[PDB]
From a paper:
Organic anion transporters (OATs) are responsible for the recognition of metabolites and toxins in the nephron and their eventual urinary excretion. The founding member of the renal organic anion transporter family, OAT1 (also known as SLC22A6), uses the export of α-ketoglutarate (α-KG), a key intermediate in the Krebs cycle, to drive selective transport and is allosterically regulated by intracellular chloride. The OATs belong to the SLC22 family of solute carriers and structurally belong to the major facilitator superfamily (MFS) of secondary active transporters. Oat1 adopts an inward open state with the canonical 12 transmembrane helices of the MFS fold, forming a binding site in the center of the membrane.
To address this question, we determined the structure of Oat1 in the absence of a ligand. The apo structure, determined at 3.52 Å, contains density within site 1 close to Lys382 and Asn439 and occupying a similar position to the keto group of α-KG. Given the buffer composition of the apo state contained high phosphate, unlike the ligand structures that had no phosphate, we modeled this density as a phosphate molecule. As phosphate has no impact on OAT1 transport we interpret this structure as the apo state. Two further densities are observed, one interacting with the hydroxyl group of Tyr230 and the other sitting close to Phe438 and Phe442, which are likely to be additional phosphate molecules. We observed no obvious density in site 2. Comparing these two structures reveals no notable changes in the backbone positions (root mean squared deviation (r.m.s.d.) of 0.629 Å for 496 Cα atoms); however, two changes in the density around several conserved side chains were observed. Aspartate 378 (TM8) can now be modeled interacting with Lys431 (TM10), whereas in the α-KG structure, Asp378 is rotated away, facing the α-KG ligand. Therefore, the binding of α-KG appears to break the Asp378-Lys431 salt bridge interaction between two gating helices, TM8 and TM10. The second observable difference is that Tyr230 (TM5) adopts two rotamer positions, whereas, in the ligand-bound structures, only one is observed.
Numbering used by the authors:
A (entry chain B): 1 to 115
B (entry chain A): 1 to 83, 102 to 318, 325 to 526
């Protein structure tokens, strides 16, 4: 099967930096689709960033462009995503998929930005 | 004093011949319109899965919550989130640009994307079967009767396919419409040639080319006027009903009557034309005795085509040329969705560019040469469409212009290959050669939508095939001998001598 256990949840002040990652299995990070999704309390599944096969490029969303950094890692079959200058409206549980719409997705990691 | 002499005896450029040639060649505008109507009524608008009514969309913050986003940022066209699962409650199509099409009405988007091209392939196999069987039936039965039945069948198929409730009914009736349309086109050109004198056959061909170009323009204009698909098909096929209504006034070719062994009907038709043309004494000079004294020479297959080996090689070369030309032409014409511009403007500019290509082609063939003209047109068109496929969708003007030049080069290649197939073939099977070339062209037009269907695996594989087939065709037809010289083969004996001559 495919497992996507993720870690990185915690409390960090606005303007800090902490990295998020989900431990994938059964596939490498240079072959298929992979995204990141948010859902704030009361908010919907907001798409954050996208990575395609073989590092085709980098792309974010309207409120995410120029603020977020996404980095892959072929060695440990993980995506190492960093965020700096944390928006205080970004309190959400971070999700990662294995395709653009897929049968396998991460369990969940919840972070707090506070002030 | 052959049949041509009798034809010029009664006018030959008179009012009757002109009125019949226009009255017979007018529906070719609708011919082109129905040819490209599958392209213009199967436009795929943006679409996505419809979320189930279990959860209200008001608390979903919009439709984007339950819709994954693709490379360009649009919602995914086939798949949806579970809060995955495929489209199970239909699709949602925006009506901002295309109110209704066949894909919008019948959900031919995902897992049914092949049916949109399969309907066009059914129309093309209809065209091929109609051409073959109705040419046989016209030779066996007649020309005016075949034409009037063609008009009736075209109108009936158009209406009863626009009002199709299901998709199988639509595909079958498009098959029948293609049948009737190929038959009416071939019998139109045949009758126009038969009733006109020898001096005006080139003028008739030029007129038919102008009519096709104007029909492309008319399709663009009407399709701009009528945005729907049922209404578009109605407004495009209904005039065939009035065409059938007025087509009972036609006068069938007397040459076919003479070839049928009956001369009284030929005589009757001759003074019918005389009365229409206004010259009565000239028709009165005709009589039963003078008919056989004028057509004594006139009154008195694939197998033989394939027995001769060098003739077989020539046939294979010309068949490959026809196949590739039609295949590339109908692979390029019916991809107007991916040019990034409204279909109306690109269709209008296609119709505009159709004619200068004919002019340039005529200049090069009658002044420079025929083989260089064919080579330049085919190879340059193939390279242009291939590099159009390679060039990404980010740029639109360059791709549009590239394809606008492509289409014109395909038209020039069509003129060149028709001139070739009518020139190098000996008069023994020259008509057989024309028929086989047209049949292989329709086979290519059959295959091309099937190739275009395989766009799900790769986003440019159909365009790669469309751009690569003409190159291989040019490579295999470079061995065709030059024919700019005056000598024109008549029998099969000089075919080997002509090869011996070069």
């Amino acid at each position: 099967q495919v497992q996507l256990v993720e870690s990185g949840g915690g409390l960090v002040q606005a303007g800090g930096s902490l990295r998020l990652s989900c431990a994938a299995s059964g596939f490498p990070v240079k072959t298929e689709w992979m995204e990141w999704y948010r859902q704030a309390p009361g908010k919907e599944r907001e798409w954050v960033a996208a990575i395609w096969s073989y590092g085709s490029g980098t792309r974010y969303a309207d409120s995410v462009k120029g603020r977020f950094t996404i980095s892959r890692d072929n060695a440990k079959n993980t995506v190492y995503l960093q965020m700096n200058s944390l928006k205080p409206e970004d309190t959400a549980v971070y999700y990662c998929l294995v395709r653009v719409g897929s049968w396998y997705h991460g369990q969940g990691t919840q972070v707090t930005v506070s002030a | 004093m052959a049949f041509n002499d009798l034809l010029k005896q009664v006018g030959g450029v008179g009012r009757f011949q002109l009125i019949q040639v226009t009255m017979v060649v007018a529906p070719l505008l609708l011919m082109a319109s129905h040819n490209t109507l599958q392209n213009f009524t199967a436009a795929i608008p943006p679409h996505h899965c419809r979320p189930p009514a279990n959860a209200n969309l008001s608390k979903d913050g919009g439709l984007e919550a339950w819709l994954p986003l693709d490379k360009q940022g649009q919602p995914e066209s086939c798949l949806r989130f579970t809060s995955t699962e495929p489209c199970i409650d239909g699709w949602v199509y925006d009506n901002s640009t295309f109110p209704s099409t066949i894909v919008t009405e019948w959900n031919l988007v995902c897992s049914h994307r092949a049916f949109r091209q399969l309907a066009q392939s059914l129309y093309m196999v209809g065209v091929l079967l109609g051409a073959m069987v109705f040419g046989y039936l016209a030779d066996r039965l007649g020309r005016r009767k075949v034409l009037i039945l063609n008009y009736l069948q075209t109108a009936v198929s158009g209406t009863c396919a626009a009002y199709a409730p299901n998709y199988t009914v639509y595909c079958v009736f498009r098959l029948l419409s293609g049948m009737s349309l190929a038959s009416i086109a071939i019998n139109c050109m045949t009758l126009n040639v038969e009733w006109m004198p020898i001096h005006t056959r080139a003028y008739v061909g030029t007129l038919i080319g102008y009519v096709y170009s104007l029909g492309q323009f008319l399709l663009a204009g009407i399709a701009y006027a009528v945005p729907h698909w049922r209404h578009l098909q109605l407004v495009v096929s209904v005039p065939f009903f009035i065409a059938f209504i007025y087509s009972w006034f036609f006068i069938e070719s007397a040459r076919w009557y003479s070839s049928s062994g009956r001369l009284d009907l030929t005589l009757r038709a001759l003074q019918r034309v005389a009365r229409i043309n206004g010259k009565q004494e000239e028709g009165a000079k005709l009589s039963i005795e003078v008919l056989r004294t004028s057509l004594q020479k006139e009154l008195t297959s694939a197998m033989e085509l394939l027995r001769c080996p060098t003739l077989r090689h020539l046939f294979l070369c010309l068949s490959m040329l026809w196949f590739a030309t039609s295949f590339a032409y109908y692979g390029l014409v019916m991809d107007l969705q991916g040019f990034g511009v409204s279909m109306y403007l690109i269709q209008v500019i296609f119709g505009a560019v159709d004619l200068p290509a004919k002019f340039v082609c005529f200049l090069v063939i009658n002044s420079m040469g025929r083989r260089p003209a064919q080579m330049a047109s085919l190879l340059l068109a193939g390279i242009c469409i291939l590099v159009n496929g390679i060039i990404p969708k980010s740029h639109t003007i360059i791709r549009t212009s590239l394809a606008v030049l492509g289409k014109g080069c395909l038209a020039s290649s069509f003129n060149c290959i028709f001139l070739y197939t009518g020139e190098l073939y000996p008069t023994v099977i020259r008509q057989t050669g024309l028929g086989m070339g047209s049949t292989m062209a329709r086979v290519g037009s059959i295959v091309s939508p099937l190739v275009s269907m395989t766009a799900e695996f790769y986003p440019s594989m159909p365009l790669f095939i469309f751009g690569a087939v003409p190159v291989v065709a040019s490579a295999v037809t470079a061995l065709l001998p030059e024919t700019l010289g005056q000598p024109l083969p008549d029998t099969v004996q000089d075919l080997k001598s002509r090869s011996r001559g070069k």
